[PDB]
Structures are given as C-alpha cells and as structure tokens.
Design brief:
The structure is cut from a larger assembly and holds chains A (67 residues) and B (427 residues). By secondary structure, chain A is mostly helical. Chain A contains one helix and no strands. Chain A has a single domain, classed as Methane Monooxygenase Hydroxylase, Chain G, domain 1. Chain B is of the alpha/beta class. Chain B has three domains: 258 residues, Rossmann fold (3-Layer(aba) Sandwich), CATH 3.40.50.1440; 114 residues, Tubulin/FtsZ, C-terminal domain (60s Ribosomal Protein L30, Chain: A); 55 residues, Helix hairpin bin (Helix Hairpins), CATH 1.10.287.600. Chain B has a ten-stranded mixed β-sheet with strand order 5-4-1-6-7-8-9-12-10-11. In chain B, α8 packs across α9. The chains are: A mainly alpha (67), B alpha/beta (427). At the A-B interface, α1 of A face loops of B. The complex binds ligand A1EE1, guanosine-5'-diphosphate (GDP) and magnesium ion. Guanosine-5'-diphosphate binds next to α1, α6, α8 and α9 of chain B.
C-alpha cells in the first residue's frame, strides 16, 4: 500500500507537469507560426508594392526611349 | 489500559469535542483540567482516556487532526477547548475539498507523519496501550481519506493493538456534496480491512430521529451531535467505569466480531432526548429495554427486523434492579428469539453501571452486530454506482493521481461485504 501511495502522488505530479509542459509548447508553437505568417503576408505586400516601382522605372524609361 | 483518541476533519473534531465535554463532565473534570467530583468510581478508570499532569491535572489522550485550521480553532475556543494538550493540534492549511484522494494521497500524506509523531509520543507514555479510537466522517476528505490513511499507518506501527472507530456515514438528508458516496465507499474499503470495531453512525438515522421522534423540524449538526455524544458516552461506559466485567477494547472485539470483516456495529440509545429540554419521568427498566431495541432508537438507519443479530451488547446506566434488568433482557430475547442467530449461543450480554449520564436517571446503550447493517452499505453502494456508471465527478479524483480501477475495487469489496452479511442472515 505504501508503494501504491507514492505511485499515486507521483502520477498527480507527472500529470500536472505534463499539462504545464504541453501548454508551454502549444503556445510557443502558435506564437512562432503566427509570427512567420504575419511576416509572410507583409513581405508579400511589400514585394508587390516594390514591383510597382520596377514598373514605374520601366514606364519612365519608355518615355525617353520614345523621344 | 490507555486508549489513544484521534479526531480528524470537520465532523470528527466536532463530535470529538462533544465526546470530551460529555465524558469530562461524567468524570468530574472541569475545562481547566482539575477534578471536582464526589464519587471515586469517577477516578478509578480515569487513565483509560486521561493523562495525569503535574499539579494533579487531567489532560485528554487526544490528538486533534485537520488539513484546515477552521474547526480546530473552534475547538480551541470552545468550552473545554483549553483542556487539550496544545502540542496535539496537528493541522495543515490547504484543506481537502471534500475529496478522499486529497486526504489520503496528496494533502493528507504531507501531514500524516507529524500526526504519527504525536501518536508515538502519546503511546510511549502508556503502561499497557489497548489501542486507538478515531472519530471521523466518511463523506468529506480529511476524516475520510486522511483518517483512513492514519489507520493504515497506525496498524503498520502497532499491528497488535485494537483499532476502533466512530464513523459518520453520509446521507442525502444531511449532505454537503454530491461526492459523499464516492468518499464513503473508498473509506468503507479501508475500514473493512483495518479496523477491529467501527460504530456506524448514520447521519440518515440521526436526522430521522431528530425530525420524527424529537419533533425538530430543522435539525442541525448540533442536534445530530447531541445524539452522537450520548451514544459515544454510552458505548464507552464499560471502558471508563468499573464493573463485574473488566472491560477493554479487545474483549469487546472478541465477543462482538465472529468473522473479521463483520465488525460494523449498529448503536442505539434510550431514552431519546433533545438538547436543552429535559423530561422528568425516568424510564422504567421495561421501557429502556423496549426502546433500545426499537428501530427508532438505532443510530444506523437499518431495520433490525430485516436482519439477524449475530451479537449484542447492552449497557444500562443508573440506580436500578439488576434482577429486573436480567428479567427484561431475557424477556426480549425469548420473545423475539428468531431475530438472534441460533448458532451463536447466548449472544446477548448486559452490563449495569451505577453512574447515569448527565440529566437522566436511567439510560440504556445498545450495540448490535446485525446482518441488517447491509442495508446501510447497499444504500451507499446504489448512490455510488448511479454516478460511477457515468464516471460523473471522477475528474476531481483522477486529478489527484487516482485511477478508475481503484473505485471498481472499493465498490466490489463493499458489495462482497453485503453478500457476506446475507450469507449469515440465512445461515
Ligand atoms: C455477546 C457479548 C458481548 C460482549 C461481551 C463482552 N465480554 N467482555 C466484554 C464484552 C463487552 C461487553 C458488552 C456488554 C456488557 C459488558 C461488556 N465489553 C465492552 C468493552 C468496551 C466497551 O466500550 C463496551 C463493552 C467487554 O469488555 C461478551 C458477549
Ligand atoms: N453528525 C454530524 N455529521 C457531520 C458534522 N459535520 C460534518 N458532518 C458530515 O460529514 C460530511 C462532510 O465531511 P467532513 O468531515 O465535514 O469533511 P472533512 O473536513 O474533510 O473531514 C457531511 O456529509 C456531513 O453529513 C457534524 O457536526 N455532525
Ligand atoms: Mg463539510
């Protein structure tokens, strides 16, 4: 009965720890995936605004080429 | 023949404190520990329950245990709260949340060793220690879970001393939480293995006695505990005063328990008195005998006519005719002899002690080992399986490391105990 008593309390400890651990890792996983995502949507927004500038060079280059 | 008393959790310490009030008044000890009595029967067996201190003071051999400080500050403030040895208040701060697993495995385990330290210091001052009596309920977490943890550890340290308990059974009529049937079933599993004698004190019966017989429309724990302390005083009369018998806990177990697991006693008391209001006609010996066998005077809500008496102890208190007591006791047997098992000859034993309890001239305490007690365990078993078949409320217990399996084992042990009682009621 003593060994059973220490197993039960070891199990409660082991379960509280595993819950804290998994919440800790679930969160760091979410915060990392969310940062990547937010950064990728911004980088794609800048990438195509910067294409607008390459096309604005191309258009000013034509007005001299044609004159 | 010293007895070591332990009281655990809210219920155990509330009925514990009343017990020491009642018997202290009987032995003529005051709330400061000084004896102010007239007779010497009061002091001949005072050491069964009291240690003697320098200054010729008397200090209960009582250890007060809780996982919460609440009730125990109440005891220490109560009338006789100062009589208790202060080193013997052993308490934590977290409480047990009416949760057997907290009392037995997590919170209680933190505190149990310091309780065993006090128990050890008490035992080592004993010429001839009989054993232990525990007051506790089975429905909360401390008295239930930690109380049965203590018993399991006391038996490991003192395997050859007697283990005696007063165990308050839960009832929906006086109910604190829905999980009482779980805590009580887990506790009965422990009691069946590790006690020699347990007085089953059914909050269901104390309620019905208060409501029907005492005409109290709204019973409180105060009304219930008045009944409990009168019973506790009655059943321990033979330990605390001298008789033709030199009575102790082991002789009681030897004569009351024909099979080791069947050690759950039905207590009864007569006359049934409400607190405060006294009545002025003493009962007659015929009346005591009839009431104390009346199901209405039983503290376990079980019908004795639905079972059979394996053994019976009867203790009459007051100035009365021993001839007439013998006559009335022989009359109740020979008139209803079918309710006594024929294969234990002469299974009824009666004692008389001169000193009555406070405020009565005549009283009778009944201790029955009846196969009808299975009704109590059936009741609790049905309430247990109603929830357990849906695993309801288990998370409170699995959160403390317990497995469903351990509930299945405890339920199944309690159902075996029921079947073992039915074996001998047909025998
Ligand atoms: C069928 C039967 C029942 C009991 C006994 C017997 N034999 N010795 C002792 C007993 C009990 C007892 C029961 C009633 C009257 C007087 C003694 N008892 C006792 C001990 C402590 C108590 O708190 C209360 C009672 C003894 O000490 C023999 C047969
Ligand atoms: N007769 C009686 N029963 C009580 C008393 N206090 C609590 N109980 C019962 O005990 C159960 C609660 O368990 P409790 O002992 O209070 O929890 P604990 O503090 O962990 O020991 C409830 O079902 C009540 O019916 C009391 O003063 N008298
Ligand atoms: Mg409570």
């Amino acid at each position: 009965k003593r060994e059973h008593e220490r197993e039960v309390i070891q199990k409660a400890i082991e379960e509280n720890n595993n819950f804290i651990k998994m919440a800790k890792e679930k969160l760091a996983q979410k915060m990392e995936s969310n940062k990547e995502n937010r950064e990728a949507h911004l980088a794609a927004m800048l990438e195509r605004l910067q294409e607008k500038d390459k096309h604005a060079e191309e258009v000013r280059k034509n007005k001299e080429l044609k004159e | 023949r010293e007895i070591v008393h332990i009281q655990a959790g809210q219920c155990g310490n509330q009925i514990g404190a009343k017990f020491w009030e009642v018997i202290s008044d009987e032995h003529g000890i005051d709330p400061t520990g000084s004896y102010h009595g007239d007779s010497d029967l009061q002091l001949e067996r005072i050491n069964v329950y009291y240690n003697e201190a320098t200054g010729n003071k008397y200090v209960p051999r009582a250890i007060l245990v809780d996982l919460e400080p609440g009730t125990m500050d109440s005891v220490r403030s109560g009338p006789f709260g100062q009589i208790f040895r202060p080193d013997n208040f052993v308490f934590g701060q977290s409480g047990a949340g009416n949760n057997w697993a907290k009392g037995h495995y997590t919170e209680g385990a933190e505190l149990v060793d310091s309780v065993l330290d006090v128990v050890r210091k008490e035992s080592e001052s004993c010429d001839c220690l009989q054993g232990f009596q525990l007051t506790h309920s089975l429905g909360g977490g401390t008295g239930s879970g930690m109380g049965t943890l203590l018993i399991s550890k006391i038996r490991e340290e003192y395997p050859d001393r007697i283990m005696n308990t007063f165990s308050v059974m839960p009832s929906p009529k006086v109910s604190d939480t829905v999980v009482e049937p779980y805590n009580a079933t887990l506790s009965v599993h422990q009691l069946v293995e590790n006690t020699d004698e347990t007085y089953c004190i059914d909050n269901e019966a104390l309620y019905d006695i208060c409501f029907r017989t005492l005409k109290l429309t709204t019973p409180t724990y105060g009304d219930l505990n008045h009944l409990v302390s009168a019973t506790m005083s009655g059943v321990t009369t033979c330990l605390r005063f001298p008789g033709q018998l030199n009575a102790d806990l082991r002789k009681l177990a030897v004569n009351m328990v024909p099979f080791p697991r069947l050690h759950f006693f039905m207590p009864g008391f007569a006359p049934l008195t409400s607190r405060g209001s006294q009545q002025y006609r003493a009962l007659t010996v015929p009346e005591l005998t009839q009431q104390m066998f009346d199901s209405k005077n039983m503290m376990a809500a079980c019908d004795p006519r639905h079972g059979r008496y394996l053994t019976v102890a009867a203790i009459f208190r007051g100035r009365m005719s021993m001839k007439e007591v013998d006559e009335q006791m022989l009359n109740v047997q020979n008139k209803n002899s079918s309710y006594f098992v024929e294969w234990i000859p002469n299974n009824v034993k009666t004692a008389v002690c001169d000193i009555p309890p406070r405020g009565l001239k005549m009283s009778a305490t009944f201790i029955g080992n009846s196969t009808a007690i299975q009704e109590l365990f059936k009741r609790i078993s049905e309430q247990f399986t109603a929830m357990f078949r849906r695993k309801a409320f288990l998370h409170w217990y699995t959160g403390e490391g317990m497995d469903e399996m351990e509930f299945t084992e405890a339920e199944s042990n309690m159902n075996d105990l029921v079947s073992e009682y039915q074996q001998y009621q047909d025998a």
